[PDB]
Design a protein around this ligand. Structure first.
Ligand SMILES: CC(C)CCC[C@@H](C)[C@H]1CC[C@H]2[C@@H]3CC=C4C[C@@H](O)CC[C@]4(C)[C@H]3CC[C@]12C
Length: 417
């Protein structure tokens, strides 16, 4: 452990980042299954051509009892890849593992063709994992348009960014573009000061709507750049004509150092590129770690996925869990306390519809009162600032949430549910 890692581990512990997380992870929902009818997507969407996801009303069969705040937290499912990245002295090998981390979060999107809850303005979600030594926090900082800010902290890595999803049903497919920038900081075990990576997420689309078999497809080009070295990585999620992803990792001089590829719903493998000028890309068996001699090595495989209601992954089941020892620590804004989403999770769809209307009406009335008094809305835990390395606006976490939580100062921090 380097000095800056222990420094970071010290701050996480003093701030009480893991208090309240003593209960064993949630393993299953109360519901065993559910039989929301399978309503045809097209039958619903044919009347709503040109609308945004947040501008459409839908049957419960097309709703999922997670918040957008928690879907973003599913970035962290395979975050062990980031500690693995931290351990490598070769900076392009760090990039290779950082790159595959960005790819690994799309396996969980398969089979969930459903709308997550649109977080209320000021809604928040915390999630700490003592067994991994990371803490995650997010706040819904904007409602028109919907935007979430995240901030994840661990001894060997940080990860934060803006979730600004812009969506459009064009009458054939449902397209989702991710407009915010993502920041991934590594504190290497050796040979390297703290280093920053930035990238933007690929696009998603729902297709097969016309055919009667709607499918989540992720697609597009991704560029990760190490602002300190500065290696870079090209990733290509192939559009459905889906599942294939390939990537190439370069040093700062343009030398192709590594390539990787696989199916982002299954597994990704990689190999060392020996001639830096090669244009070889990954053609779509060592499970012992990275190889420098040019043989292929596995890097990521998808977790096993038991059947759950709403086709949740195992990681996703742990997110909305109203753990008994956690609830006393939470602010009133935490997604675990949101009542329409809770009732939905437990299969009570009319109570969910009733509570959704109530909290949405309140949100609207608070907004109208602000406008009538010329009151500018202020986020509670984040402030928009200009990032020094990228010179982009980002949501800077104000550092107060985990210490105020530690000190039980959150009871009055919001009233939206
Ligand atoms: C009306 C219904 C059928 C529309 C359903 C659209 C679904 C597939 C869309 C809408 C919101 C989308 C999510 C929005 C944000 C993220 C975070 C990103 O880091 C990974 C993809 C992920 C998790 C998206 C997956 C696909 C998603 C869940």
């Amino acid at each position: 452990s380097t000095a800056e890692q222990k420094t970071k581990a010290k701050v996480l512990l003093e701030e009480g980042s893991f208090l309240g997380y003593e209960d064993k992870l949630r393993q299953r929902l109360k519901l065993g299954k559910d039989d929301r009818p399978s309503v045809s997507l097209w039958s619903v969407l044919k009347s709503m051509v040109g609308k945004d996801m947040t501008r459409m009303t839908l049957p419960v069969s097309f709703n999922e009892p997670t918040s957008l705040l928690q879907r973003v937290a599913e970035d962290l499912e395979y975050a062990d890849l980031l500690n693995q990245a931290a351990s490598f002295e070769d900076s392009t090998l760090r990039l290779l593992y950082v790159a595959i981390f960005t790819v690994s979060s799309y396996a969980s999107t398969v089979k969930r063709v459903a709308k997550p809850f649109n977080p209320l303005l000021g809604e928040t979600f915390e999630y700490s994992r003592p067994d991994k030594s990371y803490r995650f926090f997010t706040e819904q900082v904007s409602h028109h348009p919907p935007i979430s800010a995240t901030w994840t902290e661990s001894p060997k890595w940080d990860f934060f960014g803006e979730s600004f999803v812009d969506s459009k049903f064009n009458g054939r497919s449902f397209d989702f573009k991710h407009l915010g920038l993502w920041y991934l900081t590594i504190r290497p075990d050796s040979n390297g000061k703290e280093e920053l990576y930035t990238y933007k997420k690929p696009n998603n689309q729902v297709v097969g709507i016309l055919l009667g078999n709607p499918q989540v497809d992720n697609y597009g080009d991704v560029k990760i750049v190490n602002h300190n070295t500065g290696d870079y990585c090209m990733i290509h999620f192939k559009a459905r004509g889906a599942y294939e992803v390939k990537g190439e990792v370069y040093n700062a001089k343009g030398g192709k150092e590594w390539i990787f590829g696989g199916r982002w719903n299954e597994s990704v493998s990689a190999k060392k590129v020996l001639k830096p000028n090669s244009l070889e890309e990954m053609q779509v068996t060592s499970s012992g770690g990275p190889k420098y001699d040019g043989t292929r090595f596995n890097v990521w495989h998808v977790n096993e996925r038991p059947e759950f209601p709403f086709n949740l992954t195992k990681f996703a089941v742990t997110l909305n869990a109203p753990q008994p020892h956690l609830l006393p620590w939470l602010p009133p804004t935490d997604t675990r306390l949101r009542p329409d989403q809770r009732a939905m999770e437990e299969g009570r769809y009319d109570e969910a519809a009733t509570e959704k209307h109530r909290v949405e009406e309140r949100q609207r009335s608070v907004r109208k009162k602000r406008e009538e008094k010329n009151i500018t809305y202020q986020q509670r835990w984040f402030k928009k600032e200009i990032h020094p390395v990228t010179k982009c606006d980002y949501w800077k976490f104000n550092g107060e949430y985990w210490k105020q939580r530690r000190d039980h100062k959150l009871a009055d921090e919001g009233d939206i549910f």
